[PDB]
Design an enzyme around this catalytic site. Structure first.
Site, short mmCIF file in Angstrom:
data_model
loop_
_atom_site.label_atom_id
_atom_site.label_comp_id
_atom_site.label_asym_id
_atom_site.label_seq_id
_atom_site.Cartn_x
_atom_site.Cartn_y
_atom_site.Cartn_z
N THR A 30 0.78 -1.25 0.00
CA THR A 30 0.00 0.00 0.00
C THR A 30 0.81 1.29 0.00
O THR A 30 1.86 1.38 0.57
CB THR A 30 -0.84 0.04 1.24
OG1 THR A 30 -1.64 -1.06 1.19
CG2 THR A 30 -1.76 1.20 1.25
N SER A 31 0.28 2.29 -0.65
CA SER A 31 0.63 3.72 -0.50
C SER A 31 -0.64 4.49 -0.15
O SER A 31 -1.58 4.53 -0.95
CB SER A 31 1.22 4.28 -1.80
OG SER A 31 2.11 3.37 -2.42
N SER B 5 3.76 0.75 2.49
CA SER B 5 5.07 0.42 1.93
C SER B 5 5.55 1.42 0.89
O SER B 5 6.75 1.69 0.79
CB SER B 5 5.04 -0.98 1.30
OG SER B 5 4.03 -1.08 0.31
#
Ligand SMILES: [Cl-]
Ligand SMILES: [Mg+2]
Ligand SMILES: [Mg+2]
Ligand SMILES: [Mg+2]
Ligand SMILES: [Mg+2]
Ligand SMILES: [Mg+2]
Lengths: 243, 195, 222, 241, 250, 204, 196, 231, 244
Positions: free
Chosen positions: G1-2, G129
């Site tokens: 994920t961002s 991440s």
């Protein structure tokens, strides 16, 4: 009959006589009041000086819950302390989970539900106190009065104890004469006057006056006891009015 | 612990149990009786984890004796063996299981028949003409497969048992200090003193 | 397992293969991976076989009681919520990977649930060891505004991809169609593209081939 | 006669504690009324603030249980608030467990079941309250469901509760005899509120100021209470016709 | 606090009577009449829908309840007590049977579980008995059709036909004259409607009468197709319209 | 120390024309050591037959448990349990011990007394029902049994022919497994007669 | 994920990619990581899908029960409930949550709650991440009191870069705008954001 | 009458008779006196025997180095309550390295007694206590009643004929409050106070019990030949 | 508190009797009579149904006679609901014993445990006793055929012939008169029916107001069979002895 021998039993009227009997214990107690003002609330109570041997200023009856709520009560004093202890537990758990200090209406229902729970079973006794309490939250000032049945409402002014009727009459005059609002410092003075006027119904023993207040401007929204110069000033204002 | 054997013949069940109690590099005792009488006509021998063995044996003994007094009656060898199996079957899924293997030799007075049950610590029960626990079986089973007959006398059973002990004394690594031999028949339980 | 779910015009369709394995061995050549939770809510399940069956039955049981209690037809989101909270509670130890679909008063729905308790929403989904073969087909041929017959074709094609390409999947295709306003139609063995060919020989033995030691009549009566 | 003190049967098969809890219902001397529109469900109740020292904004017997469900109580406020807190907690848990908003009728049944338990279990007294639940259910539409200390509950076309309930009930009956339908055939909730107040005025024979009433309105996806000025706006509309 | 009532509230009197059970039966006597008739190919259970107010919607209050797809229940006595018993009865059919055997319990055994629940309210601490008598009609493969009465004591009896509540004495006598062992389901429905009219005073139509049957499997009420062995519920509630159709040829 | 292969053993069931067969070996060992050649793995409760492979203590325990449960079933239901119902009971009972399971491979076999239909089913150690038209296999020679059954089996065999097929399936499977064998028993089950036969097999 | 949330003049905007993975397989390419716990209090989820869903569901329940009794909760209160769950169950959770809400008194507010369950009130927050790759960019480009269009562009450009470098991130860029005007959902597809 | 069966029942005038009956047990108890100055606090207690062959029931109990009490009424109840105080004082020391304020000690006793007046099955404590102590705000004297009511005083007395000493101390108030830095004089005032409650009996050597705590004095009890100085 | 409403079910009278047990026995004395007779080759159980209605389903009915296992049955007098609670316990207890020892439970052991449960409700727990008296009829290989009775006190005794419920005094006198030790089952069947016929409060004893059962070794070789009589079989046995 026998309907009045056990708590939580309905009489044929639909009444809980044990709660009504607890109210009699409250009516027997000393006078306590609450005055709602512009940006806060003021609490005052009559402390009967039973003997010369009582240390003045050292049997404090008004109690703080959290840092922003004040509580005062008439009737069985230990019962009132039990209620405040619960109030403090309720307020702590609210602040723990939600971060913000407990709002006054929220706090009022916490006490209400707890007192109401003591009318549900025959294995507990109802509370022998009416409790006047309040403070300042995000929506301004709130004053409440809670009774043995669990019943509570918001009040402009509140009174309970042996001199409740005298104090109520005096409270109603303030509400009528000040539709715009009463200031915190004014309400402290008025509280002193009303306790002195309500002392006529308990005039054998002379008494000691105790006042506290929460105000957005005067105490920064926190509960503080009125002491020293401000207390003596309020006592003098009251002494001038009885004569 | 270590060596426990059992042979069921025509009229009796014979149990042989090693006398040694070894801890570390020391034989602490050479006259240990690894058996408990559960009822007048029921005998149980045991081998396994130290402490566990006697504790389990005496616990079973107490329960059967309690039953005997309550009902004024002796449980059949089959009934006792089933009770013992269930206790071990419970035990194996406990926080700390009993690590005890048992043989139960009994004479059923209602059937007039000898009966030998082999039960391991898991609660695995089998009725057998001859039984053994531990490494003993690896020598005795094949020996008994050859020499055993179902109609043997108690004396023939004892000679057959001597043959087993001799083989174990020849090929087993450890000194188990001989065996105590007990016979279970119609007249109850008695010990052979000269073996 | 390969399992899929595909939404269409007026409802949703789910499908599954019928192979059950124990290591490299096919234990069941025609097992039912489509589970009824309520009349119009059905579940496709991959993962540990006993887990998908048990968790589907328990929630199905509770959904029935709930339906009776509320005097209402059960909703897919209720089955979804109950399944996910149960699976989350067991921290993945109950190895049920489910595609939950159905129709209710709110409309038609398609969800997936992971063994650890996370849920997805989509128009097309696939789970199991053959999900990559299935998803490859779904990503290639799916479109918005599918008809009933198009969605069945797509779903079963996606299962076939798993049957032929995944060693975890095989045998037959089961389908269940849940359309709004109609009864759910369970299509057991909708496709059977893996029929065993005729054997070369009959291995029927001459009577008496097997050596016998004993015979006896067994009493089954009282 | 201890059979009158706890919830066990009397010789004639009655539960006196339940019966006396029904009498506690009228202890507040307040009458409530509920009606249904096409799109909405309106509940109105009298508001009597006798003490001049009371903060009138805090005196209420109408509660917002959930975003969609509202509840008016007939009975003492301590028992009323006890019921409200439980109803709120039950409705919140239902949504968490089952993934959709608790229907008005299901909450009614649940609260009725709790009340039934107090009529069977000795250590718990009945609550001296009658609970009227209102919503616009996403399946059933405008809904009124009512609970009592016996644990009884049922759906209503319209209903009334309080000391002078019979007058209001027959008044409503006579209207629905005339209209021949199950509801108030009106588009806006504003006029359904007006209908409710109009027919309460006729049945009780009293006039109301803006502070003598309390109004709750349920529409699709929200239940809300009206302010004094919202009611005043509504009172003006009735007077000008 | 806590339930301090850990002792029995139903106890034996010197004469041997269990007072609370007797008084519970008295509550059942005051209750509105309900009845059940067993035919050769089905069972009918019926009762009057006593409306509390004409503003009340009596459709929202169901006196006849489905317990399993093949079992239904009706009562006489206290409605709230009945409602929670139905909740408990539905659950116990799952927890103590369906979740174990993968099929619904036979009528006699579900009845047995409900009877147990009612017996425990007669002996356990701090509770009164249930103030209801139940009539449970059902079908199962190995016992066929059956009809049971469950009383506040927890006792249950199988019936060919019976009535409970207000005018049960007269209704039972009526049923004795009309019942034979060759009654077809439609004949039993006809007798049920006749028997009920005697005890009903006001309106007698499909909106004031509640009636359900245990009969043939209803595939149209199953909600799905594709499993040959699943053929649908034998329990069916007759509609308001279906009752009125039979009240013309009465 | 793999619980399902300490004692050894196998069970196989087959369906025929208006009949079912269930067979098992007689071995009970402790790893390499053969201990008993009389340990039967097939039990019956009324007309419903249950075979159980795996850890012998659990085989015994489950037999005792299902005898217990079917006895209470019969007392309350006033009828014998059917194979379909019993299969469900076995599944429920095994899944009840989901995270501490009995190390067993049970097999149900029998004829429904109402419908007359032959029924067989298999389970994993935790309750997953494996129903089959043809055959169910279980035990330490299950691979071998799968191979034997899949080739030897044909549908609608007569009771006497079905006996030959199931016997040859078991015997030849057992002889390729170190932990299975030491004797064998075959049950031929018809609507209202059951024949039990002990097979002669190699004793190594 | 961002994931990220950014306060601006009119309130606050939340942003997220749509990728859910198990190893290098994309289990869901159209995930919605922006979750409603109240009308105008939302969160961005990162870490374990199961954990963050279970937490968000519990929080939504708590705030619904809060609202029933005490009216609209503050964004701080919502963050405190998230914290309480994340802190007390830190041994059994893998959840990185950003809480974002709109008050009329407090306007836009952002609270980030990392693995340990600590709370941090910030002008903007980034997590997941993919956040590692845009610390430089976001610090250089963020300004306080941006407009709606500027804040949308800031999040779009930021998540575009996070997606470009992080294999765990991708799909569409979802955004949720929280203002006095209401709640607006925005979506941006690869063909737009990839060539920024 | 009908409302005195247990503590959980209010009378029609709002009284708790079980609490009042517990209060009555204190009135039957032997007299004990408490008084303080600004530097010291003193307990004086008249001990009671069963007969001439018996010991004299000890009335005074130490709670901490800076706190202690005297009892009148049920002695086992005083043991329970003193033990509770010992623990609360101890908790404050171990956890906060803080001597328990005599005021908090009073609040804690109030709340412990109260719980026994609102629940079924329990009974009120049947003993009155006079707690003395020296803490961060100087000398203190408290009066505990088993109703829950705790009161801070310059001086007081409880027990049979306590009214005599209580009147005396009320007269002597201005004198004894300023006996600072003189232990023996503060005790003398307390011994003279308790003498106003005597009838037919006088203070002997195995009859009198005195306790003192103050600025540079740990809570210490005097019995036997150590009180002969004061007769 | 709740003390006010406590009946105190487990206390002694000044005379040393247990009120609730005595009152439960008074309740049982109004229940339909049940008779057990033990012969040398079997046992008979006979019981009278409580005043029947003509619309009662007689064949699919069980009120008096229940099966505990294949070797043991009970006749019930008292509250049926109370009896079923105890019967289920007894059934489970029998299976526990069988599971433990792989042998069918000896009759007395089962009777003792059920009687011990009853005893408990008279000494602790503050609950009302079970208003039930049982007649136990069973067989085991230790004592053969056995009859026992237990009552609400939890006291049990063994019998050659015994009655419970209504008119036990008259029933016992009649059984004491015509019973002898060498009696056979078919003689015992006749005695049981004759006794009920004379002690009944009804006008005449008919098949529809009776439950009947035998426990014989009249199976095939050394095994025991339980026969719960069907309605028609009771009709026949009533004609065979000339009562109707
Ligand atoms: Cl409920
Ligand atoms: Mg009650
Ligand atoms: Mg082999
Ligand atoms: Mg070999
Ligand atoms: Mg985890
Ligand atoms: Mg990427």
């Amino acid at each position: 009959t026998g309907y009045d021998l056990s708590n939580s039993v309905f009489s044929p009227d639909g009444r809980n006589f044990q709660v009504e009997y607890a109210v009699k214990a409250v009516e027997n107690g000393t006078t306590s009041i609450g005055i709602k003002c512009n940006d806060g609330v003021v609490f005052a109570v009559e402390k009967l000086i039973t003997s010369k041997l009582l240390v003045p200023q050292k049997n404090v009856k008004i109690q703080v819950v959290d840092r922003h709520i004040g509580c005062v009560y008439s009737g069985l004093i230990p019962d009132g302390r039990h209620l405040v202890n619960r109030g403090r537990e309720e307020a702590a758990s609210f602040k723990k989970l939600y971060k913000t200090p407990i709002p006054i209406p929220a706090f009022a229902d916490r006490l209400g539900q707890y007192v109401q729970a003591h009318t549900l079973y025959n294995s507990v006794r109802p509370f022998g106190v009416s409790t006047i309490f309040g403070g300042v939250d995000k929506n301004g000032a709130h004053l409440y009065m809670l009774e043995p049945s669990g019943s509570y409402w918001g009040y402009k002014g509140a009174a309970t104890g042996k001199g409740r009727q005298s104090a109520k009459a005096e409270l109603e005059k303030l509400v009528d004469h000040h539709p715009e609002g009463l200031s915190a410092r004014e309400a402290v003075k008025q509280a002193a006057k009303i306790i002195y006027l309500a002392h006529e119904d308990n005039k054998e023993k002379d008494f000691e006056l105790e006042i506290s207040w929460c105000s957005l401007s005067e105490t920064n929204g926190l509960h503080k006891f009125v002491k020293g110069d401000l207390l003596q000033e309020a006592i003098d204002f009251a002494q001038k009015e009885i004569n | 612990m270590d060596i426990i054997l059992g042979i069921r013949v025509q009229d009796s069940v014979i149990l042989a149990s090693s006398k040694a109690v070894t801890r570390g590099i020391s034989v602490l005792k050479d006259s240990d009786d690894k058996t408990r009488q559960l009822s007048p006509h029921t005998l149980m021998s045991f081998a396994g984890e130290a402490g566990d063995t006697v504790q389990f044996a005496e616990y079973i003994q107490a329960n059967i004796q309690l039953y005997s007094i309550r009902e004024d009656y002796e449980l059949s060898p089959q009934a006792v063996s089933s009770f013992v199996r269930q206790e071990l079957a419970k035990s194996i899924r406990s926080r700390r299981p009993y690590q005890v293997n048992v043989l139960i030799g009994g004479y059923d007075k209602k059937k007039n028949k000898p009966e030998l049950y082999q039960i391991d610590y898991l609660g695995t029960k089998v009725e057998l003409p001859y039984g053994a626990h531990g490494y003993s079986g690896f020598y005795t089973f094949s020996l008994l497969d050859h020499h055993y007959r179902p109609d043997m006398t108690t004396e023939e059973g004892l000679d057959l048992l001597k043959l087993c002990v001799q083989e174990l004394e020849k090929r087993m690594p450890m000194d188990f200090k001989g065996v105590i031999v007990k016979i279970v028949d119609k007249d109850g339980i008695r010990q052979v003193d000269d073996f | 397992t390969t399992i899929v779910g595909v939404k269409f015009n007026n409802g949703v369709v789910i499908a599954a293969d019928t192979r059950s394995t124990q290591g490299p061995i096919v234990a069941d050549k025609n097992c039912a991976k489509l589970h009824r939770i309520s009349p119009k809510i059905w579940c496709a399940g991959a993962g540990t076989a006993a887990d998908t069956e048990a968790v589907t039955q328990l929630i199905g049981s509770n959904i029935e009681l709930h339906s009776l209690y509320t005097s209402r037809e059960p909703r897919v989101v209720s089955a979804l919520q109950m399944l996910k909270q149960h699976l989350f509670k067991y921290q993945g130890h109950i190895g049920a990977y489910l595609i939950v679909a159905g129709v209710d008063p709110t409309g038609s729905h398609l969800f997936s649930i992971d063994a650890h308790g996370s849920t997805d929403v989509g128009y097309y989904l696939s789970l199991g060891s053959g999900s990559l073969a299935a998803m490859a087909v779904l990503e290639s041929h799916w479109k918005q505004d599918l008809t009933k017959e198009e969605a069945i074709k797509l779903a079963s094609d996606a299962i076939q991809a798993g049957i032929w390409n995944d060693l975890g999947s095989g045998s037959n295709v089961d389908v269940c169609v849940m359309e709004i306003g109609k009864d759910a139609e369970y299509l057991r063995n909708y496709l059977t593209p893996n029929v065993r060919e005729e054997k070369q020989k009959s291995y029927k033995f001459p009577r008496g081939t097997t050596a016998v030691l004993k015979e006896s009549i067994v009493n089954i009566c009282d | 006669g201890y059979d009158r003190h706890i919830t066990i049967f009397s010789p004639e098969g009655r539960l006196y504690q339940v019966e006396y809890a029904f009498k506690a219902t009228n202890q507040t001397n307040i009458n409530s009324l509920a009606v249904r529109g096409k799109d909405c469900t309106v509940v109105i109740s009298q508001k009597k603030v006798p003490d001049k020292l009371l903060d009138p904004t805090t005196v209420s017997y109408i509660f917002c249980i959930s975003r969609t469900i509202g509840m008016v109580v007939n009975g003492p406020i301590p028992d009323a608030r006890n019921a409200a807190l439980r109803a709120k907690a039950e409705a919140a848990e239902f949504r968490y467990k089952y993934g959709y908003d608790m229907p008005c009728d299901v909450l009614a049944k649940r609260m009725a079941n709790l009340s039934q338990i107090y009529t069977q279990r000795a250590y718990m007294r009945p609550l001296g309250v009658i609970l009227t639940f209102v919503s616009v259910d996403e399946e059933l539409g405008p809904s009124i469901y009512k609970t009592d200390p016996a644990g009884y509950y049922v759906g209503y076309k319209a209903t009334a509760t309080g000391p002078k309930q019979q007058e209001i009930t027959t008044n409503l009956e006579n209207h629905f005899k005339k209209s021949k339908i199950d509801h108030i055939n009106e588009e806006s909730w504003e006029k359904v509120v007006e209908f409710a107040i109009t027919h309460m005025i006729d049945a009780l024979g009293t006039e109301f100021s803006k502070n003598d009433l309390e109004v709750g309105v349920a529409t699709k996806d929200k239940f809300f209470t009206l302010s004094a000025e919202n009611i005043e706006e509504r009172l003006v509309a009735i007077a000008e016709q | 606090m806590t339930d301090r009532y850990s002792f029995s509230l139903t106890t034996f009197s010197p004469s041997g009577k269990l007072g609370q059970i007797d008084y519970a039966l008295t509550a059942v006597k005051q209750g509105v009449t309900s009845l059940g008739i067993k035919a050769t190919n089905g069972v009918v259970i019926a009762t009057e829908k006593k409306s509390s107010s004409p503003l009340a919607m009596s459709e929202t209050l169901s006196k006849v309840s489905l317990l399993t797809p093949d079992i239904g229940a009706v009562y006489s006595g206290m409605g709230p007590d009945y409602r929670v018993l139905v909740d408990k009865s539905r659950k116990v059919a799952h927890t103590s049977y369906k979740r174990i055997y993968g099929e619904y319990p036979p009528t006699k055994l579900l009845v047995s579980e409900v009877a147990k629940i009612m017996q425990e309210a007669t002996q356990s601490g701090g509770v009164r008995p249930f103030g209801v008598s139940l009539l449970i009609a059902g079908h199962d493969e190995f016992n066929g059709f059956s009809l049971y009465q469950v009383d506040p004591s927890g006792s249950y009896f199988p019936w060919k036909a019976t009535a409970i509540g207000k005018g049960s004495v007269a209704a039972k006598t009526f049923l004795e004259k009309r019942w034979n062992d060759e009654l077809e389901l439609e004949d039993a429905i006809h007798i049920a409607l006749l028997t009920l009219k005697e005890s009903v005073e006001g309106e007698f139509n499909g909106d004031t009468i509640e009636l359900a049957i245990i009969g043939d499997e209803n595939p149209d009420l199953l909600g799905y197709t594709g499993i040959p062995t699943d053929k649908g519920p034998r329990f069916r509630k007759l509609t308001s319209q279906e009752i009125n159709d039979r009240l013309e040829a009465l | 120390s793999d619980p399902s292969s300490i004692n050894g053993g196998i069970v196989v069931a087959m369906t025929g024309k208006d009949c079912v067969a269930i067979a098992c070996d007689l071995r009970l060992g402790s790893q390499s050591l053969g201990v008993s050649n009389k340990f039967e793995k097939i039990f019956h409760y009324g007309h419903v037959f249950l075979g159980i492979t795996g850890l012998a203590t659990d085989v015994t325990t489950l037999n005792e448990m299902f005898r217990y449960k079917t006895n209470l079933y019969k007392l309350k239901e006033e009828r014998a349990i059917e194979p379909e119902t019993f299969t469900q009971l076995v599944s429920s009972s095994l899944y009840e011990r989901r995270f501490g399971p009995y190390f067993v491979g049970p097999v149900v076999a029998g004829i429904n007394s109402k419908s007359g239909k032959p029924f067989i089913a298999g389970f994993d150690l935790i309750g997953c029902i494996d129903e089959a038209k043809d055959f169910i296999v279980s035990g330490t020679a299950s691979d071998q049994l799968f191979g034997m059954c899949e080739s030897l089996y044909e549908p609608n065999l007569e009771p006497e022919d079905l006996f030959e097929t199931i016997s040859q399936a078991l015997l030849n499977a057992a002889d390729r497994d170190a932990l299975s064998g030491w004797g064998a028993v075959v049950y031929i089950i018809k609507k209202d007669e059951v024949v039990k036969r002990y097979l002669k097999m190699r004793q190594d | 994920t961002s994931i990220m949330a950014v306060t601006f003049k009119d309130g606050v905007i939340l942003g997220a990619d749509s990728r859910t993975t198990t190893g290098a397989y994309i289990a869901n390419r159209v995930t919605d990581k922006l979750t409603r716990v109240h009308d105008k209090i939302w969160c961005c989820r990162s870490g374990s899908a199961a954990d963050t869903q279970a937490i968000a569901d519990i929080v939504q329940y708590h705030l619904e029960l809060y609202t029933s009794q005490y009216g609209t909760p503050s964004t701080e209160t919502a963050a405190s409930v998230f914290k309480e769950l994340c802190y007390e169950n830190k041994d059994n959770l893998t959840a990185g949550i950003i809480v974002a809400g709109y008050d009329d008194k407090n306007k836009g507010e952002v609270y980030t709650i990392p693995l340990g369950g600590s709370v941090h009130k910030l002008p903007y927050a980034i997590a997941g991440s993919g956040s590692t790759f845009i610390y430089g960019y976001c610090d250089k480009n963020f300004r306080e009191n941006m407009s709606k269009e500027e804040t949308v562009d800031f999040i779009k450009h930021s998540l575009s870069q996070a997606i470009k470098w992080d294999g765990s991130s991708g799909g569409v860029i979802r955004m949720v705008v929280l203002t006095a005007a209401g709640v607006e959902r925005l979506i941006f597809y690869p063909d737009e954001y990839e060539q920024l | 009458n009908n409302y005195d069966g247990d503590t959980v029942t209010f009378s029609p005038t709002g009284r708790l008779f079980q609490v009042e009956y517990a209060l009555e047990a204190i009135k039957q108890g032997s007299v004990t006196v408490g008084l303080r100055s600004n530097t010291h606090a003193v307990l004086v207690a008249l001990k009671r025997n069963a007969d001439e062959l018996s010991s004299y029931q000890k009335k005074i109990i130490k709670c901490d180095e800076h706190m202690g009490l005297s009892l009148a009424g049920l002695a086992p109840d005083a043991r329970v309550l003193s033990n509770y105080l010992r623990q609360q004082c101890n908790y404050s020391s171990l956890v906060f390295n803080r001597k328990l304020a005599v005021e908090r000690a009073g609040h804690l006793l109030c709340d412990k007694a109260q719980k026994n007046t609102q629940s079924y099955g329990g009974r009120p404590y049947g003993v009155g206590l006079l707690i003395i102590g020296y803490d961060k705000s100087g000398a203190h004297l408290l009066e505990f009643q088993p109703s829950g009511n705790v009161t801070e005083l310059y001086g007081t007395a409880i027990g049979a004929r306590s009214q005599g000493a209580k009147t005396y101390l009320e007269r002597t108030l201005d004198t004894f409050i300023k006996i600072d830095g003189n232990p023996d004089e503060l005790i003398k005032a307390g011994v003279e106070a308790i003498s106003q409650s005597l009838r037919d009996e006088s203070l002997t050597v195995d009859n009198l019990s005195i306790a003192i705590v103050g600025k540079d004095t740990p809570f210490t009890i005097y019995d036997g030949e150590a009180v002969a100085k004061y007769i | 508190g709740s003390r006010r409403y406590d009946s105190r079910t487990t206390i002694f009278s000044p005379e040393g009797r247990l009120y609730q047990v005595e009152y439960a026995l008074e309740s049982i004395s109004h229940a339909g009579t049940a008779i057990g007779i033990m012969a040398s080759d079997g046992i008979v159980l006979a019981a009278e149904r409580k005043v029947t209605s003509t619309l009662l389903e007689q064949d699919t009915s069980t009120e008096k006679l229940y099966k505990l296992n294949d070797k043991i049955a009970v006749a019930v007098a008292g509250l049926t609901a109370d009896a079923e609670i105890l019967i289920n316990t007894a059934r489970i207890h029998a299976q526990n014993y069988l599971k433990t020892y792989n042998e069918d439970i000896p009759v007395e052991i089962l009777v003792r445990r059920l009687s011990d449960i009853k005893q408990g409700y008279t000494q602790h727990g503050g609950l009302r006793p079970f208003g039930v008296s049982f007649i136990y009829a069973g067989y085991d290989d230790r004592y053969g055929y056995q009859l026992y009775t237990s009552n609400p006190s939890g006291n049990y005794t063994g019998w050659k012939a015994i009655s419970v419920g209504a008119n036990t005094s008259a029933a016992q006198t009649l059984l004491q008169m015509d019973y002898k030790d060498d009696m056979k089952v078919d003689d015992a069947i006749e005695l049981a029916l004759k006794t009920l016929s004379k002690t009944t409060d009804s006008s005449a004893l008919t098949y529809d107001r009776l439950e009947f059962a035998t426990i014989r070794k009249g199976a095939n070789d050394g095994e025991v069979y339980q026969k719960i009589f069907k309605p028609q079989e009771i009709k026949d046995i009533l004609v065979k002895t000339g009562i109707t």
